[PDB]
Amino acid sequence: AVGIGAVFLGFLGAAGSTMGAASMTLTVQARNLLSGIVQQQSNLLRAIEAQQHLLKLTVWGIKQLQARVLAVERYLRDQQLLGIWGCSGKLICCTNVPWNSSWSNRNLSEIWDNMTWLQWDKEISNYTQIIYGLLEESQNQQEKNEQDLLALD
Amino acid sequence: AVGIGAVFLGFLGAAGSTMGAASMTLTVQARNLLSGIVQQQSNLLRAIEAQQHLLKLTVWGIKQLQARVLAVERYLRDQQLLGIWGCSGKLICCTNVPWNSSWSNRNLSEIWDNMTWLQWDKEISNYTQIIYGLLEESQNQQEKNEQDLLALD
Amino acid sequence: AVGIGAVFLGFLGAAGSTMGAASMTLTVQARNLLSGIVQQQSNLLRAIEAQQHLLKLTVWGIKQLQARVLAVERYLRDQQLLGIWGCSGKLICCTNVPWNSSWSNRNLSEIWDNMTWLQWDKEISNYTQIIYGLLEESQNQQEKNEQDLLALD
Amino acid sequence: AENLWVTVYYGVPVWKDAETTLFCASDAKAYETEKHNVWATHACVPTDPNPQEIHLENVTEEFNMWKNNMVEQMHTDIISLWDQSLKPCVKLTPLCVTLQCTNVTNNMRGELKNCSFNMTTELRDKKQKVYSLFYRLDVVQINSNKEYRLINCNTSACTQACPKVSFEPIPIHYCAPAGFAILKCKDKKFNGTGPCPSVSTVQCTHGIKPVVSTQLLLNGSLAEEEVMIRSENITNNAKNILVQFNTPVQINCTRPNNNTRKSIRIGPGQAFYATGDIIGDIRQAHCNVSKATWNETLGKVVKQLRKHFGNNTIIRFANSSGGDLEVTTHSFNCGGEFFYCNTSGLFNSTWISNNDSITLPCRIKQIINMWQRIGQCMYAPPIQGVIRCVSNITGLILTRDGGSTNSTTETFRPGGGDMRDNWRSELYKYKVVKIEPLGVAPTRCKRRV
Numbered sequence: 001a002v003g004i005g006a007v008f009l010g011f012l013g014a015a016g017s018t019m020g021a022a023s024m025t026l027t028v029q030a031r032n033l034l035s036g037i038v039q040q041q042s043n044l045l046r047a048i049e050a051q052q053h054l055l056k057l058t059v060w061g062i063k064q065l066q067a068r069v070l071a072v073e074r075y076l077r078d079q080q081l082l083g084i085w086g087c088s089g090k091l092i093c094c095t096n097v098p099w100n101s102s103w104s105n106r107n108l109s110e111i112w113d114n115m116t117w118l119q120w121d122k123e124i125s126n127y128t129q130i131i132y133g134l135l136e137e138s139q140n141q142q143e144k145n146e147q148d149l150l151a152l153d
Numbered sequence: 154a155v156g157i158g159a160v161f162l163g164f165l166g167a168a169g170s171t172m173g174a175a176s177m178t179l180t181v182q183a184r185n186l187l188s189g190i191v192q193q194q195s196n197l198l199r200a201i202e203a204q205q206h207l208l209k210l211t212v213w214g215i216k217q218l219q220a221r222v223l224a225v226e227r228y229l230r231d232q233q234l235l236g237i238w239g240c241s242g243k244l245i246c247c248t249n250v251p252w253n254s255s256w257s258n259r260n261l262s263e264i265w266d267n268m269t270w271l272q273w274d275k276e277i278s279n280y281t282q283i284i285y286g287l288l289e290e291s292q293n294q295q296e297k298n299e300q301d302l303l304a305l306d
Numbered sequence: 307a308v309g310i311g312a313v314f315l316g317f318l319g320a321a322g323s324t325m326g327a328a329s330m331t332l333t334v335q336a337r338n339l340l341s342g343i344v345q346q347q348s349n350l351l352r353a354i355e356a357q358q359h360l361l362k363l364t365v366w367g368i369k370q371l372q373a374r375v376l377a378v379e380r381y382l383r384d385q386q387l388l389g390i391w392g393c394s395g396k397l398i399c400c401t402n403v404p405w406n407s408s409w410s411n412r413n414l415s416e417i418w419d420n421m422t423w424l425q426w427d428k429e430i431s432n433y434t435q436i437i438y439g440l441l442e443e444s445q446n447q448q449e450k451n452e453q454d455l456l457a458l459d
Numbered sequence: 460a461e462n463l464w465v466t467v468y469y470g471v472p473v474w475k476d477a478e479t480t481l482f483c484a485s486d487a488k489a490y491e492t493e494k495h496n497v498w499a500t501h502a503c504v505p506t507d508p509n510p511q512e513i514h515l516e517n518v519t520e521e522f523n524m525w526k527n528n529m530v531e532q533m534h535t536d537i538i539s540l541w542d543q544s545l546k547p548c549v550k551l552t553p554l555c556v557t558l559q560c561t562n563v564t565n566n567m568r569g570e571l572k573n574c575s576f577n578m579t580t581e582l583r584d585k586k587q588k589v590y591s592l593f594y595r596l597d598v599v600q601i602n603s604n605k606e607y608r609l610i611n612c613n614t615s616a617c618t619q620a621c622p623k624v625s626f627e628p629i630p631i632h633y634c635a636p637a638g639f640a641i642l643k644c645k646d647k648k649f650n651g652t653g654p655c656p657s658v659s660t661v662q663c664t665h666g667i668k669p670v671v672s673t674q675l676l677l678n679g680s681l682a683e684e685e686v687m688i689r690s691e692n693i694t695n696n697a698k699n700i701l702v703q704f705n706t707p708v709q710i711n712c713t714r715p716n717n718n719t720r721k722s723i724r725i726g727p728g729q730a731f732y733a734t735g736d737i738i739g740d741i742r743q744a745h746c747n748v749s750k751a752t753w754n755e756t757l758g759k760v761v762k763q764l765r766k767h768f769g770n771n772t773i774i775r776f777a778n779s780s781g782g783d784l785e786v787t788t789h790s791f792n793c794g795g796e797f798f799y800c801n802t803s804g805l806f807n808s809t810w811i812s813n814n815d816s817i818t819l820p821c822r823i824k825q826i827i828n829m830w831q832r833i834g835q836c837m838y839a840p841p842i843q844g845v846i847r848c849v850s851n852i853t854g855l856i857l858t859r860d861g862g863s864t865n866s867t868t869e870t871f872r873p874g875g876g877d878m879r880d881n882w883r884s885e886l887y888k889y890k891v892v893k894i895e896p897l898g899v900a901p902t903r904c905k906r907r908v
């Protein structure tokens with residue numbers, strides 16, 4: 001089916017809906033980023049199973065095994081990067097960096113109410129490595145400000 | 154050897170103690186669930202060392218490496234599943250899902266003061282896939298309610 | 307270059323500077339502790355890619371894969387250990403263990419203002435397994451005191 | 460509000476039963492004897508010398524040794540470790556050639572044949588007349604003098620076992636991968652199937668040693684309480700009975716020939732170890748066990764079998780009736796030489812509910828074929844001089860028959876099967892479980908926003 005607010009109970013099913021309504025599904029796209037390794041860990045196995053000898057057709061299993069370490073390592077790197085911005089516990093964060101509208105001139109309605117996330121990706125992809133810099137620095141000084149504001153005890 | 158409070162300084166040693174007293178030892182299983190990999194990374198070794206040629210017996214080490222990737226990945230999935238309930242920082246959480254006493258009629262004393270965790274498992278394993286669904290949704294709306302509050306102020 | 311405060315944009319670049327000024331760098335060490343796997347995953351490739359015979363040499367690739375599973379696993383163990391002290395989201399924590407100055411007689415100025423982190427390590431490596439034990443137990447009771455403070459509602 | 464709220468815990472002490480790949484560890488002094496004087500240790504990583512049991516207080520749960528997964532992993536590991544110990548060694552293919560033969564001279568026996576044949580030198584264009592001794596079981600008459608081939612030579616090639624690699628069984632430990640635990644049933648009256656009322660966890664097993672033998676089993680571990688007898692059902696004849704003794708009974712075995720190895724170059728850097736000569740008198744290989752302590756030991760196993768079979772049932776033993784050599788005989792490797800012995804000296808007695816040695820003869824083979832794998836012949840080289848072994852007989856395998864005429868339902872015979880139940884003898888008390896560290900449980904506490 002096609003519309004808004006419907007297929008959010010399946011993986012990626014929201015993707016053509018506008019950014020506002022797509023904000024509710026995030027847990028599904030998140031859960032399935034890693035737990036899909038169930039399609040691997042149920043069945044990766046050496047010889048003596050459906051196989052008898054021909055051991056190389058199971059050491060060929062380095063294809064399937066390499067895909068697993070790449071998947072956890074991408075996941076874990078995202079969780080690091082979300083950690084160093086001071087945001088580790090959460091699917092959403094508010095953060096103290098003001099939006100420089102030179103990164104996009106667009107108003108608060110049209111971003112949430114008209115665009116898909118795929119349409120928004122094509123704008124801020126020019127500026128994202130600035131924004132990750134500002135987030136890191138804003139958190140890094142905040143950790144030290146908090147430490148002083150306890151150290152004044 | 155045999156009794157309450159005594160063997161808690163060892164892995165699983167609490168398992169026959171009642172749920173209240175076992176609740177102190179949770180860090181010990183949590184640590185040994187991953188760091189037991191010391192008994193792998195200290196001693197996994199390849200060609201020249203202990204072995205020369207017989208090359209399928211170096212490539213036999215895929216069993217040991219495959220166990221390591223399953224261990225880190227099965228652990229990492231718990232940190233995801235504990236994270237989306239809004240709870241990743243902690244060994245304990247209070248949460249705003251009410252206990253539907255259909256899942257068990259048993260009162261607050263007898264669950265903490267009489268049963269062992271292996272006994273409680275065999276009740277709630279009927280209902281747990283309801284309870285995980287409720288916990289996810291209870292956090293998913295809470296993230297949004299907080300974002301509105303930080304905005305409307 | 308040689309100084310204080312200069313090469314903090316570089317991996318390890320702070321290492322000879324004093325513990326105070328070195329504290330601003332911590333993000334740069336933390337980021338390269340895991341994401342340096344870019345140098346591995348960009349070129350560790352089996353099918354085709356300039357290589358399609360003598361494939362003993364792509365099973366010899368198990369050395370390069372073994373280093374990846376070590377790196378993710380050693381990092382993930384730090385995040386567990388930093389987690390159970392009640393500190394998982396942060397580069398810095400204040401904590402409720404009092405400093406027994408038998409672990410070092412040195413005053414608060416000379417530790418932050420004179421020493422490098424490499425000099426400090428060589429003192430506290432006597433007492434580190436005491437301090438980790440105290441941190442663990444200090445948190446393990448703090449979780450329970452908070453559960454009671456929520457239970458007295 | 461007074462009603463309860465769900466609270467989540469991590470690292471709760473809970474587990475469930477699971478299939479998982481155990482990893483093997485070997486004791487460090489064998490590992491320090493690097494580059495494989497024996498197999499397994501070259502791959503089986505060094506042990507931590509701290510095995511560290513913990514008694515799981517108040518615990519009680521069902522073990523079943525018949526449906527246990529780790530016996531099948533042991534069986535599959537041992538086969539793989541065996542093959543790779545042979546894979547680097549010389550393929551003996553050029554020996555599959557026509558032989559001229561005659562009986563041996565300097566001796567009762569007709570078991571040794573003396574045989575002559577043509578064999579390639581290292582130089583491709585040059586070949587030699589050469590001769591060696593073989594057992595009557597290694598050769599077949601292909602046919603004036605009689606003329607022969609090796610037994611295997613119509614069905615497969617064979618690998619010569621490398622002389623530097625010993626068949627002696629080292630201790631092996633099986634260790635749990637992270638987030639799994641081994642459980643060990645501690646109860647000294649455990650029979651292999653039921654709720655064990657006292658358990659320990661451990662990170663890694665006993666030093667299990669991978670011996671191999673047919674009708675009876677030796678150098679393995681033995682229970683302290685009583686002779687234990689156990690089976691997947693007992694009453695169904697097609698199931699084995701495993702018997703484990705309360706004490707060892709001690710066997711001496713010998714090969715009294717002063718044996719001489721000779722070396723033949725097959726090719727450029729390839730050599731075959733011929734049986735060269737037997738000096739002194741030729742005499743039979745054989746084994747001894749004390750008639751007194753053997754008779755006493757059967758006197759104890761009979762008292763156990765009476766618990767399952769009435770009271771004055773006429774329990775009796777007989778030899779391993781019929782079939783080929785490998786079912787009809789007790790079989791093992793001693794010192795790097797394979798034995799086959801006819802145990803009817805032991806299993807020939809009858810019982811009613813009221814100082815010197817047995818000597819049982821043996822036979823030897825140079826070609827062997829383990830686990831009946833049709834293509835995997837291998838050739839074990841001759842070993843120098845007189846050789847002998849001492850072992851603890853730990854326990855034995857029995858098979859039953861239906862009502863033999865009337866009264867008795869208990870003609871027992873020394874059994875066998877796949878070698879797999881030799882592992883089930885040592886793994887009789889272990890189990891493996893997966894930890895489930897998450898838990899959810901109700902209490903009167905709530906979070907705030």
Ligand SMILES: *[C@@H]1O[C@H](CO)[C@@H](O[C@@H]2O[C@H](CO)[C@@H](O[C@@H]3O[C@H](CO)[C@@H](O)[C@H](O)[C@@H]3O)[C@H](O)[C@H]2NC(C)=O)[C@H](O)[C@H]1NC(C)=O
Pocket residue numbers: 002003004016017018020112113114115116
């Ligand atoms: C197909 O995707 C597009 C974006 O890629 C959606 O565009 C517009 O999104 C807004 C939400 O801010 C829609 O408003 C709501 O639409 C539903 C269905 O029409 C209606 O039940 C609600 O009362 C509300 O009007 C808006 O209609 C929609 N279109 C325009 C021209 O603005 C679009 O929603 C998706 N298609 C459908 C049929 O949902």
Ligand SMILES: *[C@@H]1O[C@H](CO)[C@@H](O[C@@H]2O[C@H](CO)[C@@H](O[C@@H]3O[C@H](CO)[C@@H](O)[C@H](O)[C@@H]3O)[C@H](O)[C@H]2NC(C)=O)[C@H](O)[C@H]1NC(C)=O
Pocket residue numbers: 155156157169170171266267517
């Ligand atoms: C084996 O586990 C059982 C529980 O499954 C333990 O039995 C008894 O458990 C109760 C709580 O259900 C304990 O009661 C409390 O004891 C303290 C000290 O006596 C008292 O101050 C409290 O008011 C309350 O009565 C009890 O101590 C405990 N033990 C006995 C002997 O009753 C049992 O402890 C475990 N086995 C062993 C050998 O410890």
Ligand SMILES: *[C@@H]1O[C@H](CO)[C@@H](O[C@@H]2O[C@H](CO)[C@@H](O[C@@H]3O[C@H](CO)[C@@H](O)[C@H](O)[C@@H]3O)[C@H](O)[C@H]2NC(C)=O)[C@H](O)[C@H]1NC(C)=O
Pocket residue numbers: 308309310322323324418419420421422
């Ligand atoms: C080389 O590393 C050493 C420590 O391993 C540094 O030693 C001392 O560190 C203090 C900081 O608490 C220095 O004070 C500050 O130095 C900078 C640079 O000279 C200056 O801009 C500040 O006004 C302040 O003086 C101190 O000078 C230094 N030396 C002594 C004798 O205490 C050292 O700073 C590093 N080398 C350089 C050239 O920075």
Ligand SMILES: *[C@@H]1O[C@H](CO)[C@@H](O[C@@H]2O[C@H](CO)[C@@H](O[C@@H]3O[C@H](CO)[C@@H](O)[C@H](O)[C@@H]3O)[C@H](O)[C@H]2NC(C)=O)[C@H](O)[C@H]1NC(C)=O
Pocket residue numbers: 563564565573574575590735736737
């Ligand atoms: C197995 O068969 C082989 C080959 O037929 C026999 O080996 C040969 O035995 C004869 C004696 O029966 C040897 O000849 C004697 O050699 C000595 C050398 O000092 C000489 O003094 C004597 O006058 C006589 O010539 C012969 O060397 C030996 N080898 C060959 C290649 O012919 C063998 O006897 C049979 N039995 C055994 C137990 O090996």
Ligand SMILES: *[C@@H]1O[C@H](CO)[C@@H](O[C@@H]2O[C@H](CO)[C@@H](O[C@@H]3O[C@H](CO)[C@@H](O)[C@H](O)[C@@H]3O)[C@H](O)[C@H]2NC(C)=O)[C@H](O)[C@H]1NC(C)=O
Pocket residue numbers: 559575576577588
């Ligand atoms: C080792 O290699 C040699 C040389 O190939 C073999 O010796 C030869 O064996 C053949 C077949 O038995 C003999 O053939 C017979 O010769 C007589 C006389 O010519 C003839 O009447 C028969 O009909 C038959 O053709 C041959 O004489 C014999 N010697 C030579 C010098 O060729 C030998 O059999 C191989 N094996 C052993 C164990 O030595």
Ligand SMILES: *[C@@H]1O[C@H](CO)[C@@H](O[C@@H]2O[C@H](CO)[C@@H](O[C@@H]3O[C@H](CO)[C@@H](O)[C@H](O)[C@@H]3O)[C@H](O)[C@H]2NC(C)=O)[C@H](O)[C@H]1NC(C)=O
Pocket residue numbers: 650651652653654689690691692693
């Ligand atoms: C090994 O030892 C266990 C006890 O440690 C033996 O457990 C017994 O298992 C049998 C079935 O194999 C049970 O029999 C059943 O009992 C119920 C009673 O309600 C009856 O309705 C069924 O018709 C059947 O007879 C038995 O209760 C159970 N417990 C005891 C104490 O005997 C197990 O049989 C032993 N296995 C061997 C091969 O020795």
Ligand SMILES: *[C@@H]1O[C@H](CO)[C@@H](O[C@@H]2O[C@H](CO)[C@@H](O[C@@H]3O[C@H](CO)[C@@H](O)[C@H](O)[C@@H]3O)[C@H](O)[C@H]2NC(C)=O)[C@H](O)[C@H]1NC(C)=O
Pocket residue numbers: 711712713745746747816818847
């Ligand atoms: C296994 O049991 C048999 C029978 O008890 C043992 O055989 C006996 O061994 C002794 C020592 O070797 C023999 O004594 C010697 O006999 C020769 C020939 O008569 C004589 O020249 C020597 O001076 C000495 O008396 C004894 O005859 C022999 N008995 C029989 C009936 O064969 C055997 O040693 C036991 N042990 C093993 C490891 O097999």
Ligand SMILES: *[C@@H]1O[C@H](CO)[C@@H](O[C@@H]2O[C@H](CO)[C@@H](O[C@@H]3O[C@H](CO)[C@@H](O)[C@H](O)[C@@H]3O)[C@H](O)[C@H]2NC(C)=O)[C@H](O)[C@H]1NC(C)=O
Pocket residue numbers: 778779780781787801802803
């Ligand atoms: C199991 O035990 C029985 C009884 O001890 C063994 O029976 C005997 O088997 C042998 C052949 O292995 C028979 O030998 C022969 O003797 C007859 C004359 O009696 C002769 O004509 C034949 O040519 C042959 O040489 C023997 O008759 C037979 N019975 C007796 C009383 O000895 C049986 O072999 C044992 N099987 C195993 C594998 O232990």
Ligand SMILES: *[C@@H]1O[C@H](CO)[C@@H](O[C@@H]2O[C@H](CO)[C@@H](O[C@@H]3O[C@H](CO)[C@@H](O)[C@H](O)[C@@H]3O)[C@H](O)[C@H]2NC(C)=O)[C@H](O)[C@H]1NC(C)=O
Pocket residue numbers: 627628670677678791792793794795848849850851
């Ligand atoms: C059951 O275990 C015993 C005890 O380990 C095995 O018998 C053998 O015991 C002797 C004495 O420890 C070993 O002797 C040694 O032999 C080497 C040369 O091979 C030599 O360098 C040493 O000085 C010492 O004399 C003997 O090797 C050992 N045999 C084996 C095969 O390990 C017995 O073999 C075991 N049972 C079975 C069925 O293997």
Ligand SMILES: *[C@@H]1O[C@H](CO)[C@@H](O[C@@H]2O[C@H](CO)[C@@H](O[C@@H]3O[C@H](CO)[C@@H](O)[C@H](O)[C@@H]3O)[C@H](O)[C@H]2NC(C)=O)[C@H](O)[C@H]1NC(C)=O
Pocket residue numbers: 801802803804818819820
């Ligand atoms: C190991 O296996 C053999 C069967 O292969 C067992 O049976 C024995 O076999 C021999 C013949 O090979 C029997 O000899 C017979 O003796 C009578 C005497 O009256 C004679 O008339 C026959 O012509 C023949 O020579 C021998 O009797 C037989 N054993 C028994 C107990 O009858 C042998 O017993 C087995 N070894 C052991 C230690 O049990």
Ligand SMILES: *[C@@H]1O[C@H](CO)[C@@H](O[C@@H]2O[C@H](CO)[C@@H](O[C@@H]3O[C@H](CO)[C@@H](O)[C@H](O)[C@@H]3O)[C@H](O)[C@H]2NC(C)=O)[C@H](O)[C@H]1NC(C)=O
Pocket residue numbers: 803804807808
């Ligand atoms: C297997 O068990 C049978 C009994 O079920 C044994 O039967 C007989 O046992 C005797 C002593 O072992 C054998 O020796 C001869 O006995 C006569 C008795 O008159 C004696 O005069 C002779 O001097 C000699 O000692 C006897 O041959 C044997 N008879 C039969 C029918 O087997 C049998 O010996 C047992 N076999 C083994 C290897 O244990």
Ligand SMILES: *[C@@H]1O[C@H](CO)[C@@H](O)[C@H](O)[C@H]1NC(C)=O
Pocket residue numbers: 561562569570
């Ligand atoms: C012993 O030698 C003779 C004559 O060569 C032969 O007939 C007999 O079959 C041989 N015996 C055996 C058991 O091979």
Ligand SMILES: *[C@@H]1O[C@H](CO)[C@@H](O)[C@H](O)[C@H]1NC(C)=O
Pocket residue numbers: 754755758808809
């Ligand atoms: C020794 O064997 C004889 C005959 O089988 C038997 O009478 C005796 O009871 C056995 N010894 C013991 C202690 O049972």
Ligand SMILES: *[C@@H]1O[C@H](CO)[C@@H](O)[C@H](O)[C@H]1NC(C)=O
Pocket residue numbers: 762765766769770
């Ligand atoms: C029958 O055998 C059992 C086990 O040995 C024993 O407990 C019982 O007393 C015996 N009964 C008779 C009548 O012999």
